[PDB]
Every structure is written in structure tokens, then in C-alpha cells.
């Protein structure tokens, strides 16, 4: 009587389902980087044409 059950202890009020929050999806993206050139070496002038 105190816990509001039946004669055999079965609950008189149906327990709520408590539907979960459920998982979510994941995402990824691209990443870039930048660089410069190398020092220009003075070409040793040959004799050819």
C-alpha cells in the first residue's frame, strides 16, 4: 500500500521508458599548408651556346 503496488508487488504505475539521447555522427575536413621556394643559385656560365 505504501509503495502503491498490487497484492504481489507488481507496480500500479507503468515505468516510463526513458528513451535515450542516442549517438550522433562525426565529421572530418581537409587541412592545407604553404611553403616557399629555394634560393636561386647563380648558374655558372659555360662556354656553349
Amino acid at each position: 500500500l505504501r509503495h502503491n503496488l498490487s497484492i504481489d508487488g507488481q507496480p500500479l504505475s507503468l515505468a516510463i521508458y526513458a528513451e535515450p539521447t542516442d549517438p550522433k555522427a562525426l565529421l572530418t575536413s581537409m587541412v592545407q599548408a604553404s611553403q616557399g621556394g629555394s634560393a636561386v643559385l647563380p648558374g655558372t656560365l659555360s662556354l656553349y651556346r
Binding site: 505504501r2 509503495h3 502503491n4 500500479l12 504505475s13
Partner: protein
């Protein structure tokens, strides 16, 4: 528990019936046995519900 729900008048019915039973069953001391011999208490078999 908090699951049970009732009304003010129903709670008053419960309390008054319990008090009448306490007075009639001679467990509460200094009961007014002179008052307890009226028609209603004689017909308490059909007046308890």
C-alpha cells in the same frame, strides 16, 4: 510514497474513519464511552464504509 493521489475530502474520510475506529476499539484512553453508544456507532458495521 508520492505516487498515490487523493483528494482533501477523501483524506478527511480516511482520518475520520481511523479516529472513529480508534475511539471505538477502546485503545485510545479516556474515550467518551457515553457518547460512543449512539445509533451511528451501533450501526458502524454499515457506517464504516
Amino acid at each position: 510514497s508520492s505516487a498515490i493521489k487523493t483528494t482533501r475530502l477523501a483524506e478527511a474520510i480516511a482520518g475520520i474513519q481511523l479516529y472513529i475506529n480508534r475511539a471505538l476499539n477502546r485503545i485510545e484512553p479516556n474515550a467518551r464511552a457515553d457518547v460512543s453508544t449512539r445509533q451511528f456507532f451501533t450501526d458502524w458495521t454499515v457506517n464504516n464504509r
